[PDB]
Amino acid sequence: KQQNFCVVELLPSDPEYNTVASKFNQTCSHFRIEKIERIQNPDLWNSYQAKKKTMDAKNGQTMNEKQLFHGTDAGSVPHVNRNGFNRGKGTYFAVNANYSANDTYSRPDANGRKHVYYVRVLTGIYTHKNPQNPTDLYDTVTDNVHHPSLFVAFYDYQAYPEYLITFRK
Amino acid sequence: QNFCVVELLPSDPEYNTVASKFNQTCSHFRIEKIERIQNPDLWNSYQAKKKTMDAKNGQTMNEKQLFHGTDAGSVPHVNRNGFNRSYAYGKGTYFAVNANYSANDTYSRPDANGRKHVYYVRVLTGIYTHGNHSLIVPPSKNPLYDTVTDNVHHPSLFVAFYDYQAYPEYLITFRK
Ligand SMILES: C[C@H](c1ccc(Nc2nc3c(C(N)=O)cc(F)cc3s2)cc1)N(C)C
Ligand SMILES: C[C@H](c1ccc(Nc2nc3c(C(N)=O)cc(F)cc3s2)cc1)N(C)C
């Protein structure tokens, strides 16, 4: 599985577009969206979904998945499109787009453009598990359990980079 | 102008054709992957401009495969748009006969992980002349040329000024 990918542009006339634009614009209405792309990566998607089938069957009534934001520099984009966020070693995801929208994470490129993904993450059972069963770990960690602003994933195929929002100041 | 990026296997005949050409001047580097870029609209727009050109320049071989180094940031932009507008022998996109020119750190600028990127590009060089810094557009053949170059009888580079004049066919990712 060498996880090739395709990049389709979401058009304003797509029902998926309002939803991503809305969620993004909750915190980032002062940026202007240049475009939104759907990242299509079959091997990566299947691998993500396999982790989820498992995770759904193990965590009972827990809703394992959330859609979160991750900002990154323009040069990491092909790497994320192909390999996701694969490879104690964590990748950060924001609940709100403004956080990911920071220059430290979404480094503005030569044309001024910034890149934040709208990401499907398997947050599962998280804390800020069992002494009797020490090989049993939390799926993610957060900054605050009752009112989270971020999540940290560690394992492979735990997140799919479904949408890429390109924008500027 | 959506696109796909297919990674080639070293087993692939294509992979070796591209690797051979790159290694002629750049064998001292380590190739990590060679991907093929599939952008149907851009490819179409290129083949149209080529149909026009092969019908214009008689016996001329209009097409050359040249190299182009760039930073990791530009890769998604090139994949989608080509070498289009937003990108001392004229104000266009420069392309090299030999990989090692493109492999210069100022063009194929090393990323965070030390990875360099060089396209192997189909370019419609067509009929070309010697170029100059105040160009912006090709000279007229008589008081219009397709590209310009540094030296007309032994060219080492080429400069294109229009869109759809080149297709970013392969991407070569490598390191020192
Ligand atoms: C670029 C990459 C890297 C980049 C950033 C970080 N740190 C962090 N990133 C984030 C993001 C975000 N959208 O990126 C969002 C957050 F709410 C918190 C953090 S902490 C850690 C690693 N590095 C592995 C090279
Ligand atoms: C780094 C990259 C960039 C791309 C092109 C240039 N200008 C120039 N590039 C080249 C290249 C080449 N392989 O790209 C090859 C040459 F024989 C001459 C020039 S001049 C300068 C920077 N990016 C900023 C667009």
UniProtKB/Swiss-Prot annotation, chain A:
Residues 1-169 form the PARP catalytic domain. Induction: Up-regulated by IFNG in macrophages. Down-regulated by IL4 in macrophages. Auto-ADP-ribosylated. It comes from Homo sapiens. Interacts with STAT6. Interacts with PARP10. Interacts with PARP9 in IFNG-stimulated macrophages; the interaction prevents PARP14-mediated STAT1 and STAT6 ADP-riboslylation. The chain holds residues 1613 to 1801 of 1801 of the full protein. The lineage of its organism: Eukaryota, Metazoa, Chordata, Craniata, Vertebrata. This is Protein mono-ADP-ribosyltransferase PARP14. ADP-ribosyltransferase that mediates mono-ADP-ribosylation of glutamate residues on target proteins. In contrast to PARP1 and PARP2, it is not able to mediate poly-ADP-ribosylation. Has been shown to catalyze the mono-ADP-ribosylation of STAT1 at 'Glu-657' and 'Glu-705', thus decreasing STAT1 phosphorylation which negatively regulates pro-inflammatory cytokine production in macrophages in response to IFNG stimulation. Belongs to the ARTD/PARP family. It is found in: Nucleus; Cytoplasm. The gene is PARP14.
UniProtKB/Swiss-Prot annotation, chain B:
Signal peptide: none annotated. Expressed in macrophages. It is found in: Nucleus; Cytoplasm. It comes from the Eukaryota. Residues 1-176 form the PARP catalytic domain. ADP-ribosyltransferase that mediates mono-ADP-ribosylation of glutamate residues on target proteins. In contrast to PARP1 and PARP2, it is not able to mediate poly-ADP-ribosylation. Has been shown to catalyze the mono-ADP-ribosylation of STAT1 at 'Glu-657' and 'Glu-705', thus decreasing STAT1 phosphorylation which negatively regulates pro-inflammatory cytokine production in macrophages in response to IFNG stimulation. Interacts with STAT6. Interacts with PARP10. Interacts with PARP9 in IFNG-stimulated macrophages; the interaction prevents PARP14-mediated STAT1 and STAT6 ADP-riboslylation. Belongs to the ARTD/PARP family. This is Protein mono-ADP-ribosyltransferase PARP14. It comes from Homo sapiens (Human). The gene is PARP14.
